Amino acid sequence: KTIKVALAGAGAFGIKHLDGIKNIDGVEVVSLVGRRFDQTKEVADKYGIAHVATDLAESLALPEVDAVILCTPTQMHAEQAIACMKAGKHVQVEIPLADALKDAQEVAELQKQTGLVAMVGHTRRFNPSHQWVHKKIEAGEFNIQQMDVQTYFFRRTNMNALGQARSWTDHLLWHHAAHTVDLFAYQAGSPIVKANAVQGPIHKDLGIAMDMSIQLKAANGAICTLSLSFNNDGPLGTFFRYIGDTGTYLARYDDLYTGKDEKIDVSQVDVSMNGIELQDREFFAAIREGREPNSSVQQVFNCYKVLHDLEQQLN
Amino acid sequence: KTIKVALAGAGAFGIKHLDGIKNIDGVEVVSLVGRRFDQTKEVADKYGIAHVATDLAESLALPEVDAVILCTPTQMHAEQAIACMKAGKHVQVEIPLADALKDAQEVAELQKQTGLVAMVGHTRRFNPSHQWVHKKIEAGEFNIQQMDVQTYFFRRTNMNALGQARSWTDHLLWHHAAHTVDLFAYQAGSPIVKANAVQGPIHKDLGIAMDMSIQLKAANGAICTLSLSFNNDGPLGTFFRYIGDTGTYLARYDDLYTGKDEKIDVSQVDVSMNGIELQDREFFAAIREGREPNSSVQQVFNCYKVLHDLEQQLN
Ligand SMILES: NC(=O)c1ccc[n+]([C@@H]2O[C@H](COP(=O)([O-])OP(=O)(O)OC[C@H]3O[C@@H](n4cnc5c(N)ncnc54)[C@H](OP(=O)(O)O)[C@@H]3O)[C@@H](O)[C@H]2O)c1
Ligand SMILES: NC(=O)c1ccc[n+]([C@@H]2O[C@H](COP(=O)([O-])OP(=O)(O)OC[C@H]3O[C@@H](n4cnc5c(N)ncnc54)[C@H](OP(=O)(O)O)[C@@H]3O)[C@@H](O)[C@H]2O)c1
DSSP, X not given: OOEEEEEEOOSHHHHHHHHHHTTSTTEEEEEEEOSSHHHHHHHHHHHTOOEEESSHHHHHTOTTOOEEEEOSOGGGHHHHHHHHHHTTOEEEEESOSOSSHHXXXXXXXXXXXXXXXXXXEOGGGTSHHHHHHHHHHHTTSOOEEEEEEEEEOBOSSSBOTTSOBOSSOOOIIIIIIHHHHHHHHHHHTSOEEEEEEEEOOBOTTTOSBSEEEEEEEETTSOEEEEEEESBOOSSOEEEEXXXXXXXXXXXXXXXXXXXXXXXXXXXXXXXXXXXHHHHHHHHXXXXXXXXXXXXXXXXXXXXXXXXXXXXXXXX | OOEEEEEEOOSHHHHHHHHHHTTOTTEEEEEEEOSSHHHHHHHHHHHTOOEEESSHXXXXXXXXXXXXXXXXXXXXXXXXXXXXXXXXXXXXXXXXXXXXXXXXXXXXXXHHHHOOOEEEEOGGGTSHHHHHHHHHHHTTSOOEEEEXXXXXXXXXXXXXXXXXXXXXXXXXXXXXXXXXXXXXXXHHTSOEEEEEEEEOOBOTTTOSBSEEEEEEEETTSOEEEEEEESBOOSSOEEEEEEEESSOEEEEETTEEEETTOOEEOOTTSSSOSOHHHHHHHHHHHHHHHTSOOTTBHHHHXXXXXXXXXXXXXXX
């Protein structure tokens, strides 16, 4: 049976999901939700999506919709995920699951009560380059001693990754550090037992910190260093360095390199080189098979606990 | 008057000082100290140094010797600096001033009692690339928001930067973090008021930490992130990222780049492109002029206090 999907938020990431979903057999997006009808309709027509709404509830009232993908602004995710599960729909939520621990806990509790698939978009789990390193670790061929990570944008304005203006404000802690806090514990195969952060001054017009530094230690002794900035005038995005016992690796999105700039071939690891498509394939596989997805709300939640502890430190 | 110098420690760095000193008028190295007479004699003959000793005291007993440069192993620096000042000789000590706060305090107290020039080799103050950034800051054209730093070696054995085996064991904190701990406060123009570190496991055969993560915050709100490793199988050394209000800069030894990898011309900043030579020029200028040097024991000592606080944290 074709799984019918509502997609909420036709921004840059919602577009990346729609483009990925075109490659996944037996899934169809039947409803598109976005803040402005005319702009939403233009996207729906480009993608052939029949239903267009300005409220998520309108798509939740459709009985045929089986699943929801949330690419809305972060501040809406937990409430909307809760609403989806109250309507009986599986839900995938873009990272972060929430910007508060309480709301992430409320989402986890409703998922536990419903037994529905609720997934968080920790795409780093699904990028082929990180999967390659992960598979070497599971094989016992590699152990992480230190991860050194830079998450940098030039974002003194409320802009997305394509340089377009946002109507909402982003956050260094809940959205960007979340990728690394989760991914470090995942790749180390060991829980985080120490975390320290420091932040710079709050920006007068955006109300968020523009610079942040995070340090993690896993119970097995692996450490991670993370630098975050919205002030970086250079190449935007995340660069990851794995320093291990048997090697060094540099991950740059879906690309992997040795510490000597030798590019490693990851095109063989998974059926797609697109991590967003692999994330959605895992989500829909879990729905069809009645299993938990990789990056379930349950799997990623200790990340949000660490983020809360860092936030309390920063205040 | 020619300033006569004793150099202690014909290692990789002692040779680099000798090559620099060859370009400094009115300075002459008359004594060379090293652990094995024949190897020290071979270097002395290559550089035309007449006196060869295996003990520093032999060079300190020479009445003609005016100054000492200490490029010995770190464990010896503080004691030897004290010996220099007790014999009435000016001294420059390679970084670190000491691997313990107590010994650094003893060197500072003897410097204060004697009023002799005692300098520490914080070469980052004198590299043309860092001087360029410092001068932009002094002009009020640039303010640091974040510094992101990687200090990496592949050093599972007691080897110097040329890959030759050392007879002594190195240390991530006191020797390597010291460059950045000092350089951050110096370039930020603001004292460090918060520091946090975590480290990996102690190495069975060397007895030292192989990985370390340090985070600093200055009183003005600027932050620093520092990753250190002896496990990095890649390009060895230090890479610096300055993220400021007006720009982004990448320092790689004496080279400087923008955040877009455009190389900046630093040949206009100072009379030499060799930071070690400029360090010695500053040392000899301060002796000749009867002034305090840049990177004096007094200027850098708060760095060693920060290092002590970090070691207490790690324990
Ligand atoms: N690595 C990853 O997996 C990854 C990457 C990027 C983003 N994300 C997450 O994805 C989310 C969105 O990111 P983005 O960069 O796509 O954002 P974006 O381009 O700024 O906008 C997302 C869309 O949500 C829409 N929207 C606003 N209010 C809405 C409402 N009430 N109902 C429905 N839609 C509404 C916006 O419409 P208007 O702007 O026209 O009002 C926009 O088109 C964020 O939470 C982000 O953290 C994850
Ligand atoms: N950025 C900088 O300015 C910078 C950079 C790197 C290091 N340094 C510091 O500079 C110092 C030396 O570094 P390196 O790489 O040159 O060290 P190195 O190559 O390991 O050795 C320095 C020399 O000292 C000699 N030595 C040993 N015992 C001695 C003794 N009792 N009396 C006299 N000489 C003796 C060693 O001889 P054997 O090998 O025969 O013992 C060696 O030839 C270290 O403290 C290091 O931290 C500064």
